[PDB]
Amino acid sequence: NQQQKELVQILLGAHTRHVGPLFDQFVQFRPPAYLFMHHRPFQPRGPVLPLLTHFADINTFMVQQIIKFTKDLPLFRSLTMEDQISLLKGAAVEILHISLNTTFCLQTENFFCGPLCYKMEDAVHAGFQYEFLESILHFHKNLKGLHLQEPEYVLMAATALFSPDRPGVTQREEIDQLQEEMALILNNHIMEQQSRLQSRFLYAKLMGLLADLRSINNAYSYELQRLEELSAMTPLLGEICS
């Protein structure tokens, strides 16, 4: 209706102000020189520590940017403090990918954040599991195929943020309302923007994707352990999914 166009307006702003530009800022976190190129090769013995360290640094940065993001959402900060924790711990990573996706390029399957170009190799070389990374490249290729708009991206993010099944919550009924409200708006925005991008079941697909994020997130908490160093390097990410 009207109050909706207002909510979306609120979100869109909070987003464009706190996360939209988080990618350009990755150069602040000691990115290994190669990352500035679009064609390597790299040293088979080249210290991986720096790269891993970078991955942990950009993520911490992205999670704290994502928080500042949620703080600009009255509907959010209007919840129990412990409730905000459970929703953050439950969707910070999920929101991260939905937002990171805007830098993903299909022709190359690379992530382009400012002067940097993150390839899949980098992650494997950094130490993460191939299977895991592969599930991530999948999410991004999918989501990027749907050719979403800025309003739909943030709308999809907020639908993930306000999720009742997220462990640790209490005002489930209270939060559930936010989600169902969040979904309606998301669908409405879609419908009121018919064919010629269609893929019609666009809303049916994002629900799929929100499910795939679930799995992907469920994997983070797993990777952190299998990598010692990381945990210590980034406490925040360790808190979020632990």
């Binding site: 704290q64 703080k71 403090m81 953050l88 640790g168 406490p235 808190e239």
Partner: peptide
């Protein structure tokens, strides 16, 4: 959940960092 303190620190603390 008792744990989660970095988070709490983060939610409130007024942003501008300092």
């Amino acid at each position: 959940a008792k744990e989660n303190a970095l988070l709490r620190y983060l939610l409130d603390k007024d942003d501008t960092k300092d």
